[PDB]
PDB file of C-alpha atoms in Angstrom:
ATOM      1  CA  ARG B   1      -0.024  -0.108  -0.033  1.00  9.27           C
ATOM      2  CA  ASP B   2       1.192   3.569  -0.884  1.00  9.86           C
ATOM      3  CA  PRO B   3      -1.388   6.236   0.885  1.00 12.31           C
ATOM      4  CA  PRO B   4       0.426   9.406   0.878  1.00  8.56           C
ATOM      5  CA  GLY B   5      -1.185  11.955   3.059  1.00  8.10           C
ATOM      6  CA  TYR B   6      -3.265  14.754   1.232  1.00  5.86           C
ATOM      7  CA  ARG B   7      -1.107  17.891   0.879  1.00  6.93           C
ATOM      8  CA  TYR B   8      -2.657  20.588   3.316  1.00  7.90           C
ATOM      9  CA  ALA B   9      -0.839  23.466   1.722  1.00  2.80           C
ATOM     10  CA  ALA B  10      -2.478  22.911  -1.632  1.00  4.47           C
ATOM     11  CA  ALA B  11      -6.092  22.375   0.255  1.00  5.23           C
ATOM     12  CA  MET B  12      -5.487  25.359   1.949  1.00  2.70           C
ATOM     13  CA  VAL B  13      -6.742  26.957  -1.073  1.00  4.44           C
ATOM     14  CA  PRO B  14      -9.710  24.764  -2.671  1.00  5.37           C
ATOM     15  CA  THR B  15     -10.812  24.873  -5.770  1.00  3.65           C
ATOM     16  CA  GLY B  16     -14.719  24.250  -5.090  1.00  2.18           C
ATOM     17  CA  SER B  17     -16.824  23.333  -1.889  1.00  4.93           C
ATOM     18  CA  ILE B  18     -18.576  20.206  -1.257  1.00  6.45           C
ATOM     19  CA  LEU B  19     -22.125  20.166  -1.178  1.00  5.47           C
ATOM     20  CA  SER B  20     -23.717  17.213   0.822  1.00  5.54           C
ATOM     21  CA  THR B  21     -22.443  16.496   4.110  1.00  3.00           C
ATOM     22  CA  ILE B  22     -22.546  13.138   5.583  1.00  2.83           C
ATOM     23  CA  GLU B  23     -20.847  10.992   8.131  1.00  3.66           C
ATOM     24  CA  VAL B  24     -17.862  10.104   6.004  1.00  2.50           C
ATOM     25  CA  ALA B  25     -16.263   7.268   8.080  1.00  3.02           C
ATOM     26  CA  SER B  26     -19.481   5.102   7.408  1.00  2.00           C
ATOM     27  CA  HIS B  27     -18.185   4.047   3.659  1.00  2.00           C
ATOM     28  CA  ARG B  28     -14.314   4.625   3.855  1.00  2.00           C
ATOM     29  CA  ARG B  29     -13.850   2.265   0.693  1.00  2.00           C
ATOM     30  CA  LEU B  30     -14.197   4.851  -1.890  1.00  2.00           C
ATOM     31  CA  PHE B  31     -10.939   6.665  -0.783  1.00  2.00           C
ATOM     32  CA  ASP B  32      -7.357   5.820  -0.343  1.00  2.00           C
ATOM     33  CA  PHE B  33      -5.899   8.060   2.199  1.00  2.00           C
ATOM     34  CA  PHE B  34      -8.604   8.534   5.051  1.00  2.00           C
ATOM     35  CA  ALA B  35      -7.825  10.510   8.269  1.00  2.00           C
ATOM     36  CA  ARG B  36     -10.049  11.355  11.348  1.00  2.00           C
ATOM     37  CA  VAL B  37      -8.974  14.203  13.775  1.00  2.00           C
ATOM     38  CA  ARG B  38     -10.137  15.390  16.966  1.00  2.00           C
ATOM     39  CA  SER B  39     -10.260  18.942  17.063  1.00  2.00           C
ATOM     40  CA  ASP B  40      -6.570  19.264  16.320  1.00  2.00           C
ATOM     41  CA  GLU B  41      -3.693  17.210  15.763  1.00  2.00           C
ATOM     42  CA  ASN B  42       0.129  17.862  15.809  1.00  2.00           C
ATOM     43  CA  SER B  43       1.112  16.282  12.229  1.00  2.00           C
ATOM     44  CA  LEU B  44      -1.235  18.866  10.702  1.00  2.00           C
ATOM     45  CA  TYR B  45       1.688  21.546  10.897  1.00  2.08           C
TER      46      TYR B  45
ATOM     47  CA  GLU M   1     -41.926  21.665 -17.253  1.00  2.00           C
ATOM     48  CA  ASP M   2     -39.441  22.900 -20.195  1.00  2.00           C
ATOM     49  CA  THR M   3     -38.711  21.682 -23.661  1.00  3.31           C
ATOM     50  CA  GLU M   4     -35.499  23.694 -24.791  1.00  6.44           C
ATOM     51  CA  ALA M   5     -32.455  23.808 -22.122  1.00  7.85           C
ATOM     52  CA  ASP M   6     -29.413  26.004 -21.824  1.00  6.06           C
ATOM     53  CA  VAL M   7     -25.999  24.252 -21.940  1.00  6.62           C
ATOM     54  CA  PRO M   8     -22.683  25.154 -21.865  1.00  4.75           C
ATOM     55  CA  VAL M   9     -20.413  24.488 -24.937  1.00  5.30           C
ATOM     56  CA  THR M  10     -16.601  24.451 -24.171  1.00  2.00           C
ATOM     57  CA  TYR M  11     -14.556  21.831 -22.318  1.00  2.00           C
ATOM     58  CA  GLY M  12     -12.168  22.705 -19.677  1.00  2.00           C
ATOM     59  CA  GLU M  13      -8.263  22.763 -20.525  1.00  2.00           C
ATOM     60  CA  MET M  14      -5.349  22.212 -18.053  1.00  2.00           C
ATOM     61  CA  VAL M  15      -2.105  23.051 -19.591  1.00  2.00           C
ATOM     62  CA  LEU M  16       1.246  22.860 -18.043  1.00  2.00           C
ATOM     63  CA  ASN M  17       2.523  25.658 -19.433  1.00  2.00           C
ATOM     64  CA  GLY M  18       4.229  28.279 -16.789  1.00  2.00           C
ATOM     65  CA  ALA M  19       6.023  27.368 -13.635  1.00  2.11           C
ATOM     66  CA  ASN M  20       3.754  24.583 -13.313  1.00  2.03           C
ATOM     67  CA  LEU M  21       5.494  22.896 -16.147  1.00  2.00           C
ATOM     68  CA  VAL M  22       9.379  23.026 -14.173  1.00  2.00           C
ATOM     69  CA  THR M  23       8.194  21.285 -11.169  1.00  2.00           C
ATOM     70  CA  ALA M  24       6.816  18.524 -13.465  1.00  2.00           C
ATOM     71  CA  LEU M  25      10.397  18.255 -14.865  1.00  2.00           C
ATOM     72  CA  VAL M  26      12.584  19.301 -12.410  1.00  2.00           C
ATOM     73  CA  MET M  27      10.360  18.503  -9.148  1.00  2.00           C
ATOM     74  CA  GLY M  28       8.553  15.391 -10.420  1.00  2.00           C
ATOM     75  CA  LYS M  29       5.184  16.592  -9.586  1.00  2.00           C
ATOM     76  CA  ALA M  30       2.262  18.999 -10.534  1.00  2.00           C
ATOM     77  CA  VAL M  31      -0.423  20.988  -9.057  1.00  2.00           C
ATOM     78  CA  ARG M  32      -3.593  21.708 -11.002  1.00  2.00           C
ATOM     79  CA  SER M  33      -3.349  25.665 -11.005  1.00  2.00           C
ATOM     80  CA  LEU M  34      -0.077  26.429  -9.336  1.00  2.00           C
ATOM     81  CA  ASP M  35      -0.312  29.773 -10.794  1.00  2.00           C
ATOM     82  CA  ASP M  36      -2.674  30.665  -8.213  1.00  2.00           C
ATOM     83  CA  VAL M  37      -2.191  28.220  -5.174  1.00  2.00           C
ATOM     84  CA  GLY M  38       1.359  29.593  -5.569  1.00  5.74           C
ATOM     85  CA  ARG M  39       0.064  33.121  -5.238  1.00  3.48           C
ATOM     86  CA  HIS M  40      -2.112  33.122  -2.343  1.00  5.94           C
ATOM     87  CA  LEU M  41       0.266  31.401  -0.377  1.00  3.07           C
ATOM     88  CA  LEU M  42       1.981  34.709  -0.211  1.00  4.94           C
ATOM     89  CA  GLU M  43      -0.984  37.084   0.481  1.00  6.04           C
ATOM     90  CA  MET M  44      -2.215  34.539   3.311  1.00  5.85           C
ATOM     91  CA  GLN M  45       1.491  34.566   4.785  1.00  2.56           C
ATOM     92  CA  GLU M  46       0.675  38.466   5.117  1.00  2.00           C
ATOM     93  CA  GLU M  47      -2.665  39.576   5.822  1.00  2.00           C
ATOM     94  CA  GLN M  48      -5.362  37.831   7.744  1.00  2.00           C
ATOM     95  CA  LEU M  49      -7.568  34.938   8.340  1.00  2.00           C
TER      96      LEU M  49
ATOM     97  CA  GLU J   1      56.433  34.108  -0.544  1.00  2.00           C
ATOM     98  CA  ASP J   2      53.852  36.780   0.666  1.00  2.00           C
ATOM     99  CA  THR J   3      52.651  37.242   4.368  1.00  3.13           C
ATOM    100  CA  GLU J   4      49.152  38.828   3.731  1.00  2.84           C
ATOM    101  CA  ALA J   5      46.419  37.162   1.475  1.00  3.07           C
ATOM    102  CA  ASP J   6      43.170  38.394  -0.056  1.00  5.09           C
ATOM    103  CA  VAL J   7      40.386  36.688   1.615  1.00  4.69           C
ATOM    104  CA  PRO J   8      36.455  36.944   1.006  1.00  3.97           C
ATOM    105  CA  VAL J   9      34.875  38.396   3.662  1.00  7.07           C
ATOM    106  CA  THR J  10      30.745  37.518   3.767  1.00  4.23           C
ATOM    107  CA  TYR J  11      29.479  34.217   3.324  1.00  4.23           C
ATOM    108  CA  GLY J  12      27.181  33.192   0.921  1.00  4.86           C
ATOM    109  CA  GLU J  13      23.121  32.383   1.356  1.00  3.24           C
ATOM    110  CA  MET J  14      20.474  30.055   0.135  1.00  2.00           C
ATOM    111  CA  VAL J  15      16.961  31.630   1.300  1.00  2.00           C
ATOM    112  CA  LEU J  16      13.440  29.850   0.043  1.00  2.00           C
ATOM    113  CA  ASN J  17      11.787  33.238  -0.175  1.00  2.00           C
ATOM    114  CA  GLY J  18      10.509  33.043  -3.556  1.00  5.39           C
ATOM    115  CA  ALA J  19       8.849  30.448  -6.265  1.00  3.95           C
ATOM    116  CA  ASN J  20      11.284  28.096  -4.400  1.00  4.92           C
ATOM    117  CA  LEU J  21       9.081  28.655  -1.397  1.00  4.98           C
ATOM    118  CA  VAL J  22       5.794  27.470  -2.812  1.00  6.18           C
ATOM    119  CA  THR J  23       7.011  24.151  -4.016  1.00  8.38           C
ATOM    120  CA  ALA J  24       8.776  23.472  -0.416  1.00  6.51           C
ATOM    121  CA  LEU J  25       5.106  23.683   0.927  1.00  9.74           C
ATOM    122  CA  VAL J  26       3.270  22.475  -1.524  1.00 10.17           C
ATOM    123  CA  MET J  27       5.347  20.074  -3.670  1.00 10.22           C
ATOM    124  CA  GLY J  28       7.421  19.169  -1.212  1.00 12.52           C
ATOM    125  CA  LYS J  29      10.896  19.651  -2.622  1.00  8.20           C
ATOM    126  CA  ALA J  30      13.284  22.633  -2.982  1.00  4.05           C
ATOM    127  CA  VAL J  31      16.025  22.811  -5.687  1.00  4.69           C
ATOM    128  CA  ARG J  32      18.701  25.224  -4.713  1.00  5.83           C
ATOM    129  CA  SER J  33      18.132  28.269  -7.442  1.00  7.81           C
ATOM    130  CA  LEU J  34      14.832  27.438  -8.925  1.00  6.77           C
ATOM    131  CA  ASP J  35      14.114  30.813 -10.346  1.00  5.06           C
ATOM    132  CA  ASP J  36      17.214  30.281 -12.675  1.00  6.37           C
ATOM    133  CA  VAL J  37      16.725  26.618 -13.529  1.00  9.64           C
ATOM    134  CA  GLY J  38      13.067  27.499 -14.184  1.00 10.96           C
ATOM    135  CA  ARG J  39      14.226  30.166 -16.473  1.00  9.49           C
ATOM    136  CA  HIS J  40      16.717  28.223 -18.497  1.00  6.30           C
ATOM    137  CA  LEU J  41      13.904  25.433 -18.662  1.00  8.71           C
ATOM    138  CA  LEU J  42      12.201  27.798 -20.957  1.00  7.65           C
ATOM    139  CA  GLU J  43      14.578  29.478 -23.224  1.00  5.86           C
ATOM    140  CA  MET J  44      16.620  26.337 -23.628  1.00  5.79           C
ATOM    141  CA  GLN J  45      13.452  24.331 -24.563  1.00  7.29           C
ATOM    142  CA  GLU J  46      12.260  26.858 -26.972  1.00  8.79           C
ATOM    143  CA  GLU J  47      15.910  27.549 -28.932  1.00  8.63           C
ATOM    144  CA  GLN J  48      18.679  25.520 -29.195  1.00  5.47           C
ATOM    145  CA  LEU J  49      21.733  23.248 -28.198  1.00  5.68           C
TER     146      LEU J  49
END
C-alpha cells in the first residue's frame, strides 16, 4: 500500500466546495488516504 | 416543465504552461493551478484569516 | 612568498523566499536556485543546443 497523506498547503486553497454532508467514515472504501482528527492534531503542522 | 434547455459549450483545459511545468520536470510533481495556489500562499502569509 | 593574503569576507546565502518556497510547502521539494533553472528550462526548451 502507498497511501500518501494529502497536501495541506494546497488544500488550504480549495478549488471548489463540497455540497452534501454525511458521516464520511461510514463508507471508507471509496477513498485511499483517510484520516480522522479530533479538533486538532500535531502532524498537521 | 420545459422543452429547450441552455447548455454550456466548451470543455475545460489544463495545460502545464508556466512554472507548473518546471516542477513537472525538475520537481517531479504537478499541481492543478499552481499559478494561484502559489500566489495565495504569499498574501495569506501576510494579511489575515 | 607572501605574508598577506586576500580573503573573502561575507558568507553566501540560500533562502527559500521566492517561487522556490511554494514548492517547499506544496510539492515538498526545493531546488537550490529555482528562479534560474526555471527560466533556463524555457529559453533552452524553445531554442537550441
